[PDB]
Amino acid sequence: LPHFSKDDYSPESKGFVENSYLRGLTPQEFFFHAMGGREGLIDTAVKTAETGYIQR
Amino acid sequence: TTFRFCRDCNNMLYPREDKENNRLLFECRTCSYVEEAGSPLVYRHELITNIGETAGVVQDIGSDPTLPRSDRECPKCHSRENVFFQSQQRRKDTSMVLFFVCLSCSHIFTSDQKNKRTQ
Amino acid sequence: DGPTMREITETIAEAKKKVLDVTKEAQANLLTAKHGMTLRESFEDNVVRFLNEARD
Amino acid sequence: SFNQFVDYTLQDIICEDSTLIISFGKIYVT
Amino acid sequence: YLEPGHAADQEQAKLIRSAIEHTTLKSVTIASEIYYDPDPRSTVIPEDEEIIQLHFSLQQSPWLLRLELDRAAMNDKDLTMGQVGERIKQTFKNDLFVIWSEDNDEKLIIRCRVVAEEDHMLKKIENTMLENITLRGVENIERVVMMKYDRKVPSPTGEYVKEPEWVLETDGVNLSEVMTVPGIDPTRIYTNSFIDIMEVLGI
Amino acid sequence: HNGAPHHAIEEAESLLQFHVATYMDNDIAGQPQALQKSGRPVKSIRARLKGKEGRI
Amino acid sequence: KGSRFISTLQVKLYGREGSSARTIKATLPYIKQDIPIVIIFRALGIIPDGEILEHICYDVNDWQMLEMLKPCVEDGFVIQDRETALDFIGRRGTALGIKKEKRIQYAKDILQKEFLPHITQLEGFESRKAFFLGYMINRLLLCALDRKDQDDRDHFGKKRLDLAGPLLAQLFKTLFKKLTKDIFRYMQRTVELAINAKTITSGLKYALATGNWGEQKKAMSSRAGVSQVLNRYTYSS
Amino acid sequence: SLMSCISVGTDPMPIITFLSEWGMEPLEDYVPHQSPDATRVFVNGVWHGVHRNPARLMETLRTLRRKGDINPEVSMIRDIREKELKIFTDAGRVYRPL
Amino acid sequence: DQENERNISRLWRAFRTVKEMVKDRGYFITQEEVELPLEDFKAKYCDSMGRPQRKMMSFQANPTEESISKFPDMGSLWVEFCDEPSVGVKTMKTFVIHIQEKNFQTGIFVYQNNITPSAMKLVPSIPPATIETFNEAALVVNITHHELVPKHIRLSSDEKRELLKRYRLKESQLPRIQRADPVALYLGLKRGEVVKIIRKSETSGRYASYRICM
Amino acid sequence: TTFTHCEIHPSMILGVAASIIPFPDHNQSPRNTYQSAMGKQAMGVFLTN
DNA sequence: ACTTTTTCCGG
RNA sequence: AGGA
DNA sequence: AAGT
Ligand SMILES: [Zn+2]
Ligand SMILES: [Zn+2]
Numbered sequence A: 001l002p003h004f005s006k007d008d009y010s011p012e013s014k015g016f017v018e019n020s021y022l023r024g025l026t027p028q029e030f031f032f033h034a035m036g037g038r039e040g041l042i043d044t045a046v047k048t049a050e051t052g053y054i055q056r
Numbered sequence B: 001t002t003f004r005f006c007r008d009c010n011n012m013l014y015p016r017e018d019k020e021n022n023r024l025l026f027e028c029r030t031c032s033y034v035e036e037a038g039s040p041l042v043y044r045h046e047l048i049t050n051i052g053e054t055a056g057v058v059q060d061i062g063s064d065p066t067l068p069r070s071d072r073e074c075p076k077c078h079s080r081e082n083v084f085f086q087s088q089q090r091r092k093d094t095s096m097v098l099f100f101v102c103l104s105c106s107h108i109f110t111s112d113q114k115n116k117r118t119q
Numbered sequence C: 001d002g003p004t005m006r007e008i009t010e011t012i013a014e015a016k017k018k019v020l021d022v023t024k025e026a027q028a029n030l031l032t033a034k035h036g037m038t039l040r041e042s043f044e045d046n047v048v049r050f051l052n053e054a055r056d
Numbered sequence D: 001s002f003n004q005f006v007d008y009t010l011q012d013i014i015c016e017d018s019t020l021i022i023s024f025g026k027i028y029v030t
Numbered sequence E: 001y002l003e004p005g006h007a008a009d010q011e012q013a014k015l016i017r018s019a020i021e022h023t024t025l026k027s028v029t030i031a032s033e034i035y036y037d038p039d040p041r042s043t044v045i046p047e048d049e050e051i052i053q054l055h056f057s058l059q060q061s062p063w064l065l066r067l068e069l070d071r072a073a074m075n076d077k078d079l080t081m082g083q084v085g086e087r088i089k090q091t092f093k094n095d096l097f098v099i100w101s102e103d104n105d106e107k108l109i110i111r112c113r114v115v116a117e118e119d120h121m122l123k124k125i126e127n128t129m130l131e132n133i134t135l136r137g138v139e140n141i142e143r144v145v146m147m148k149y150d151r152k153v154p155s156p157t158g159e160y161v162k163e164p165e166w167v168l169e170t171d172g173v174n175l176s177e178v179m180t181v182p183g184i185d186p187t188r189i190y191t192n193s194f195i196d197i198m199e200v201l202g203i
Numbered sequence F: 001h002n003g004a005p006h007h008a009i010e011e012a013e014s015l016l017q018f019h020v021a022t023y024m025d026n027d028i029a030g031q032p033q034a035l036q037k038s039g040r041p042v043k044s045i046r047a048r049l050k051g052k053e054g055r056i
Numbered sequence G: 001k002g003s004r005f006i007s008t009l010q011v012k013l014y015g016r017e018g019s020s021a022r023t024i025k026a027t028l029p030y031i032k033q034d035i036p037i038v039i040i041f042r043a044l045g046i047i048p049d050g051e052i053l054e055h056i057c058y059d060v061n062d063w064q065m066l067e068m069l070k071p072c073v074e075d076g077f078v079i080q081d082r083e084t085a086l087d088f089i090g091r092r093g094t095a096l097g098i099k100k101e102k103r104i105q106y107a108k109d110i111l112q113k114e115f116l117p118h119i120t121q122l123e124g125f126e127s128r129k130a131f132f133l134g135y136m137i138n139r140l141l142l143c144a145l146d147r148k149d150q151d152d153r154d155h156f157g158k159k160r161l162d163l164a165g166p167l168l169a170q171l172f173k174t175l176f177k178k179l180t181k182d183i184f185r186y187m188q189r190t191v192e193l194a195i196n197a198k199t200i201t202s203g204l205k206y207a208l209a210t211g212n213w214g215e216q217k218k219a220m221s222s223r224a225g226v227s228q229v230l231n232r233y234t235y236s237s
Numbered sequence H: 001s002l003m004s005c006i007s008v009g010t011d012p013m014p015i016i017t018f019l020s021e022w023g024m025e026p027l028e029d030y031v032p033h034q035s036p037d038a039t040r041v042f043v044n045g046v047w048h049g050v051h052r053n054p055a056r057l058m059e060t061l062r063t064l065r066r067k068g069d070i071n072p073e074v075s076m077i078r079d080i081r082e083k084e085l086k087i088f089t090d091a092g093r094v095y096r097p098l
Numbered sequence I: 001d002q003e004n005e006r007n008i009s010r011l012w013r014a015f016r017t018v019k020e021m022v023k024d025r026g027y028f029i030t031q032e033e034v035e036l037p038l039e040d041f042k043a044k045y046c047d048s049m050g051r052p053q054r055k056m057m058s059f060q061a062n063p064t065e066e067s068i069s070k071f072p073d074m075g076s077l078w079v080e081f082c083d084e085p086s087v088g089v090k091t092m093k094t095f096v097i098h099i100q101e102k103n104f105q106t107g108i109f110v111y112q113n114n115i116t117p118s119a120m121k122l123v124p125s126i127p128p129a130t131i132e133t134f135n136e137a138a139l140v141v142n143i144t145h146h147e148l149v150p151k152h153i154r155l156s157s158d159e160k161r162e163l164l165k166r167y168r169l170k171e172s173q174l175p176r177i178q179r180a181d182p183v184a185l186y187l188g189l190k191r192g193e194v195v196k197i198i199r200k201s202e203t204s205g206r207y208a209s210y211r212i213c214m
Numbered sequence J: 001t002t003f004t005h006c007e008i009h010p011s012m013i014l015g016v017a018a019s020i021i022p023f024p025d026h027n028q029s030p031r032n033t034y035q036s037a038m039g040k041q042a043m044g045v046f047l048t049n
Numbered sequence K: 001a002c003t004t005t006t007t008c009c010g011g
Numbered sequence L: 001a002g003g004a
Numbered sequence M: 001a002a003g004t
Helices: A027-055 C002-027 C039-055 D002-013 E010-020 E049-054 E071-076 E081-092 E119-131 E175-179 E194-201 F007-024 F045-049 G037-044 G051-056 G063-076 G082-090 G100-105 G108-112 G126-144 G164-189 G198-210 H013-020 H054-067 I005-024 I038-042 I089-101 I157-166 I182-186 J029-038
Strands: B013-018 B023-028 B034-036 B041-044 B082-086 B098-102 B108-110 E029-036 E063-069 E097-100 E109-113 E134-136 E144-149 E152-154 E160-162 E165-170 G010-013 G024-027 G034-036 H024-026 H039-043 H046-051 H075-079 H084-088 I059-061 I077-081 I106-111 I130-135 I151-154 I194-201 I205-213
Touching (some): C002 C039, D002 G164, E063 E119, E081 E109, E081 E119, E175 E194, F007 F045, G010 G126, G034 G063, G037 G051, G037 G063, G037 G082, G051 G126, G082 G100, H054 H075, I005 I038, I005 I106, I077 I089, I089 I106
Parallel strands (some): H039 H084, I077 I106
Antiparallel strands (some): B013 B023, B082 B098, E144 E165, G010 G024
16 A cells, blocks of 8 residues: 555555454555455355356 | 677677687678677576666665665664665565665665675 | 453564564575475465464 | 536547548537 | 385485475576687686696587586585586587586586587577476476375274374376385375376276 | 359359358358348347257 | 557567577567567668667666577568668568568558557657667566566556546547548539438437447447446435 | 546646756657666656656656646656656546545 | 496386286286395396396296186286387287297287387287287386275176176166276276276275276 | 655545445445445435425 | 356346 | 346 | 367
């Protein structure tokens, strides 16, 4: 993100969500969780379609 | 390596052997030019390269804000102001060693605790 | 409960330092890669392992 | 976007290969 | 899976690890160079001066192929300059004259000459050398790892007891070959490529 | 049957071959896809029998 | 804007990692074969090597990049002057389009019109067109030599959303030039006022009505689902 | 997003005409090894020339846009490492205020 | 000694497996005969240099008393090893008319690198006798000993006739084994022959499949 | 100390539908994507006319 | 050189 | 265009 | 995303 200095391999820069849902997420933690979430939904959609033909 | 061109064509120079005197020549295949080789080396491959490690280090490198700072004392002037970066040789293998550029002398030093360099 | 949240914070705190320690160790060339792996691959495996150990 | 299209882009498409052996001048939008 | 006997012998595993893991001349080489060294008996390169002196005492091309090997790389995938050169020598047979710096020597070097028009021929040789040369192991078999798996096995007293073993995991497949290898169990070997199991062991 | 202008016959023949072809299968590799004056292509007998939603 | 020649030019690096003949050829618009870069600079005007290499590699101390450019010089060596470089390019059509004077004249035009259409599509701007082609080869090599990183096709700054207005621009253009040809048609018929204003109205309507951004009721490939009915379930929707 | 906007499309010339009068060497007259490290300038992917001290130019450009003179929607990026200064008048670019 | 020791280690192992295969086919071979140690192999088929003497290895084998009861017309076998890596039409015409004269039933040719296309053209030419080509380098390890390989049993013409009667099958209706199958080669399966495959079952303990040769 | 710009408000990364989610930062990543599809099926006054 | 599948249900 |  |  542009809110990071270059060559930052730290937990925070690479998406480690230190916080609990109860405490809340930081804008960085939120956006990273968001990328992670997106991958799962694309998988769900792709898997659902593949898995069907396999059954057939 | 460092290769030269013809001084009449500007077209590139190809090697030729002077079997008679056992000496290396560079000929021009456009005209009739020939010159003795300055080096015995005609080609170098280089597989584990170290050229590109510290590329694009302009004197404006201190101005880029996207770059991080550190309080590491400089080897040449002891200035605790440096703009570090990683091996710009964009290869898989590559070590995570740093290269600090001074903000006064503008000299390049590593965080390397295995070897000593000059690049 | 409050004391368990102190314990959890300091649980992440030590695993964050464990990551920094392996980060400085890898910037200093001292880090010795795992057989059949990039020096970086070897580092990331360890970082991702500490952060997920702490999550648990 | 539409504003740039009416105010400018439209007056431009109107004259580029407009001139025919008869060319097109200024466009008016009611 | 390791030969019946040597179950917990980690050093046995390492042997077969090296015996099968593929290593190329490219994987050891730092850089290769072509120099014009017209006299074979003496060298323009001052470092080399030493190497000629010995690999002479106790006709060919003037153009030289000089490649530098990496010490640390020659270490991980255990290797000797002797065995490296011996391969290069056994590859190009008699048409290529090979010399090499000793394992002790500070810099690792391999000098090669031949037996009108030469410049290009030598570059064709360096391409065979780097790419088309095997040093160690079986082809296709890449990253090889040692694993300490747990095998439940009947003890003398009769009870099945957790008695672990060293096992090799490959990042490539070549069954026909890694089976005929000494020091393994060609009764226990397994590949996830069942297309290969079908071809080698039957339907 | 009339005064056969030959090139005109091999021309009218090839067109009949086209229609008899495109009627059974309209989706041929050799690209002219017989189309109803509406742009919309003519539905092949093949297309009618073709899988998932379609006769069989 | 204007005609919009969506001609894409590729600068290919033949031969893979660890193979001899690491030649650089570039697929030029309206040209069958992939011409070696050197023939291009020569056809462009930049006749000698080194003058060609000056445009590609800027640092005379970057031996690594230059050794990489040596096979290119070898490939191109066969052609020598500007003329014989254009003739080689004219030999590869289109089809071929036989005759020497014809093939040479072609390639003169492909460079002016089809080659690097932005910058300029004019005449005497060979200087700019060369330095750029070189900038491309430089960037090509920079990646092969593991210095620059391979371009992320999915970086957002490299994308552009075509909004309402420019969607119409593409459409209006297509129809205005369709009217422009019907305008020439009635001017022709006048062997000696009947300018169908319907084509434009009906076209824009058809488009915004179906969502089929193509010409016209004969759709595919047109691009459908561009226009659509505004959802009104809630003010949010 | 709520703050996202799209570039409408401006004119490159008032920036091109400006750049020349500010230290840009035309591409027709470039000497790759005489002026070697020169920061190369592109306006909408069209390589226009080279600038000797890009730091001074980048500061004058930023001030025209921030004042009003150069359109605020006009994108202008200076990669120090790469030694390039790419400018964008280009209609389509998604922008956000900061 | 060097890496000459290994070309031997392997030729010994390949022989042991060739010995096993012949025993398994139903021929008379001892267990001590198979178990012939390395040092003892050297001291039989090794010259004045301690190098392999393949021309000596070659051995005739006969049917066990048991085999002539199941398959009466099951004749005699001959296994001819060759000392030349590339086997040519010259060394092949030898072995071929050897079987023809010595009225053999079957013959196995164990070659190192190849059997020339000229020589291979003579393999079917001598009926009712049959010939088998076998790359030495394959035989180094016995596939039949592997975990995954169950017991295959060649059926008699009377046994196959019965399998078909008992399960009311047409030849088609049977699971098939390829003529080129590692095990079908090891057992020298001819097209139409059936194998009984006795496999272990996590379900029943022992399950018997059948495969006809294609 | 290199900061060239500041973010107006981070909640502006969100678009129309997500901006109706209460505490979306205290939610699991997709639960928000689900809501930013459901609110388009809800009822209520869509216009005063 | 060249083809074909991809879970189930108001206009 | 939309639900599971 | 695979395979004649
Ligand atoms: Zn010359
Ligand atoms: Zn300093």
